[model samples]
Target: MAEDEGYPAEVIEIIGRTGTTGDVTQVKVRILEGRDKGRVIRRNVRGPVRVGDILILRETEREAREIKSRR
Candidate 1:
């Protein structure tokens, strides 16, 4: 979970999908960069995951008048 559209990436799927209840191992991915740049959701994290993924490189507003009227 590393996407940041309005800083919205705080996933915690911590594994557990079948007979589900948590601790399947820990896997959660979230990618949301809408406005024509969003679509990639994978699922599997209960035993193996180590930064081989998680990259949503844009979209976060600090409201400084939209960052000083755009950089």
Candidate 2:
């Protein structure tokens, strides 16, 4: 089955993995549940995203984030 590249995704689980470049710290995530599953990809290292953090997984685009205020 093909995955829909239309909606954003959030991390559910982190399947520990090692990058091909020998980074040795990576994971594969099931981006969406039910609707979209098994779309495993490497999770970026942005200072450790909490379990409940919202993460968007999309191809052919730059991934970036911004901090508004200290909470």
Candidate 3:
């Protein structure tokens, strides 16, 4: 496993909102540089996540599942 601050990634798309709560956005991101580079994985985040923002990720993670549909 790589260390020294997980990885750098870029927001690719907004899948949808999370639950029925406040400001949690499900998004897909392309890891800028890492073992997971060139791959887009699902993640959840707070507000202000633009389609082109660079987000720095940390360890202790799991590639998130896709946003669940309105069920």
lDDT (tens digit, per residue) of candidate 2 on 27-61: 44455644655465556442444454555554625
Ten consecutive residues with minimal summed lDDT in candidate 2?
44-53
Question: What would the per-residue lDDT of candidate 1 be over residues 25-68, giving only the tens digit for each residue?
Answer: 44454644445434444453445555444534344223344445
Q: Each candidate: what lDDT?
A: 0.43, 0.51, 0.76
Could you tell me how far off, in angstroms, the CA of residue 21 lies in candidate 1 after the best superposition?
Answer: 22
Models, CA RMSD each: 14.6, 11.6, 5.5
Model 3 per-residue lDDT tens digits across residues 6-49: 67888888798885557687888888887668878887766656
Residue 51, model 3, lDDT: 85
Quick one: best TM-score, which candidate? 3
State which candidate has the highest lDDT. Answer: 3
- Residue 14's lDDT within candidate 1 is 38
Inter-residue clash pairs, candidate 3: none
Error in Å for residue 62 of model 2: 11
For model 1, the run of ten residues with the poorest summed lDDT: 3-12
Clashing pairs in 2: none
